[PDB]
Amino acid sequence: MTEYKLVVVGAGGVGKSALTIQLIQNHFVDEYDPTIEDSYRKQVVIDGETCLLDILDTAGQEEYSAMRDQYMRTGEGFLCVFAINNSKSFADINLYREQIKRVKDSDDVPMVLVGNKCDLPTRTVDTKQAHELAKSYGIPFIETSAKTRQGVEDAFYTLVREIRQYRMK
Amino acid sequence: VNPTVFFDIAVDGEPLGRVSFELFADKVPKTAENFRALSTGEKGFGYKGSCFHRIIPGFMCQGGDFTRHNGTGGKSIYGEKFEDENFILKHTGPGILSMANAGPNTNGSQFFICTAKTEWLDGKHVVFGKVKEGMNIVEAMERFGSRNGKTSKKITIADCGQLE
Numbered sequence: 001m002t003e004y005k006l007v008v009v010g011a012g013g014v015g016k017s018a019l020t021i022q023l024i025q026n027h028f029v030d031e032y033d034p035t036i037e038d039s040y041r042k043q044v045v046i047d048g049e050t051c052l053l054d055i056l057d058t059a060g061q062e063e064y065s066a067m068r069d070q071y072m073r074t075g076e077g078f079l080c081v082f083a084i085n086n087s088k089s090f091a092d093i094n095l096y097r098e099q100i101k102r103v104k105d106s107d108d109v110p111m112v113l114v115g116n117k118c119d120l121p122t123r124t125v126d127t128k129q130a131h132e133l134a135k136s137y138g139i140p141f142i143e144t145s146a147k148t149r150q151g152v153e154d155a156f157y158t159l160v161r162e163i164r165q166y167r168m169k
Numbered sequence: 170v171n172p173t174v175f176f177d178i179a180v181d182g183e184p185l186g187r188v189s190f191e192l193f194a195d196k197v198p199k200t201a202e203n204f205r206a207l208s209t210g211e212k213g214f215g216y217k218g219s220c221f222h223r224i225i226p227g228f229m230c231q232g233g234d235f236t237r238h239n240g241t242g243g244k245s246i247y248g249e250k251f252e253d254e255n256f257i258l259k260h261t262g263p264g265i266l267s268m269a270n271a272g273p274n275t276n277g278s279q280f281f282i283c284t285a286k287t288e289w290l291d292g293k294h295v296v297f298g299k300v301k302e303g304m305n306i307v308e309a310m311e312r313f314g315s316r317n318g319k320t321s322k323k324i325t326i327a328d329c330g331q332l333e
């Protein structure tokens with residue numbers, strides 16, 4: 001069984017852990033439990049083949065931005081998450097992408113842009129703006145809700161497909 | 170005169186020992202008083218029976234969530250949260266007692282005890298006390314922590330109160 005190393009990154013409070021826990025445990029709770037660093041495992045059938053996902057849920061806490069290099073070296077693909085009601089979190093995305101590009105010394109890193117909390121009516125980030133950013137990076141963009149599960153499997157499975165393609169190069 | 174409180178710490182229900190703290194009521198009276206009252210339980214709720222849910226060897230032991238017991242809860246005697254009183258005192262080394270928070274003006278009941286100097290927390294967490302006796306008990310609690318803070322045994326406040 002092929003084992004994919006996924007890493008979930010993005011600013012504090014955008015829903016990185018809620019997305020991961022929805023995928024792994026099929027569960028959502030509204031409580032705030034800010035992350036130090038957590039790791040999960042899940043096997044899934046993607047495009048008719050069983051995959052094993054190793055998922056690293058990272059801290060958004062802004063004070064430790066210089067502590068990310070080790071996990072960026074280790075990870076194969078990255079879920080870059082912002083929240084659609086937090087414009088600062090969308091601006092932070094480019095900062096994360098530049099950091100991953102530097103550490104891996106590459107422009108071709110498997111990556112998916114995720115706009116989370118789409119269940120909420122108070123949108124401040126235009127969907128077209130995010131699509132355009134993802135197009136400029138050459139990566140997929142998926143809108144998700146960890147609360148309703150919209151797009152959750154699509155985001156993680158899409159990232160697996162991006163890595164699958166990368167591995168065949 | 171600054172008040173003194175104690176925790177009797179247990180590991181999986183077995184006594185480990187007593188840690189005592191001086192609370193700096195002269196510099197942070199509102200924050201000191203919250204911790205003092207939660208230690209006696211005199212408002213009908215408080216630290217007794219709660220656990221240290223996050224212990225990271227080399228840095229700190231964190232606890233104080235007596236409402237959800239999962240590291241997400243806690244409340245002050247003033248309401249769920251209260252404001253940062255001041256940042257006069259610094260995280261100068263092992264033994265410092267300081268409030269956990271989720272950003273500016275979000276103090277509740279969660280707190281941490283430093284096991285090293287944590288200077289980058291200065292100006293972001295309110296320091297309000299320090300270990301007086303039993304720092305080696307706090308050092309002993311680090312034996313049950315881990316890199317991400319998950320504990321390997323249940324570390325509890327079996328009893329707490331104020332010393333005369």
Ligand SMILES: CCn1c(-c2cc(N3CCN(C)CC3)cnc2[C@H](C)OC)c2c3cc(ccc31)-c1csc(n1)C[C@H](NC(=O)[C@H]1C[C@@H]1C)C(=O)N1CCC[C@H](N1)C(=O)OCC(C)(C)C2
Nearest residue numbers: 034035036037059061064067225228269270271279281316
């Ligand atoms: C990069 C990895 N990382 C690290 C980190 C940092 C270093 N450095 C090495 C070089 N030096 C100079 C700088 C630091 C080394 N190794 C690691 C760890 C061991 O690598 C896994 C930390 C950390 C903190 C958070 C997220 C990721 C984090 C975080 C996420 S929420 C938070 N902090 C603040 C936390 N709020 C809460 O709980 C809210 C829910 C309640 C109400 C809070 O009030 N307190 C009290 C103070 C301590 C803090 N918890 C905490 O646990 O700090 C852990 C610590 C290890 C001290 C710092």
Ligand SMILES: Nc1nc2c(ncn2[C@@H]2O[C@H](COP(=O)(O)OP(=O)(O)NP(=O)(O)O)[C@@H](O)[C@H]2O)c(=O)[nH]1
Nearest residue numbers: 013014015016017018030034035060117145146147
């Ligand atoms: N309405 C709504 N709330 C969400 C969604 N995802 C997360 N939340 C809420 O947003 C808050 C933060 O979620 P969390 O997953 O902890 O964010 P995080 O990115 O892991 N934060 P950190 O970087 O500190 O670990 C919680 O209150 C959570 O319930 C979502 O899709 N919709």
Ligand SMILES: [Mg+2]
Nearest residue numbers: 016017034035
């Ligand atoms: Mg998280």
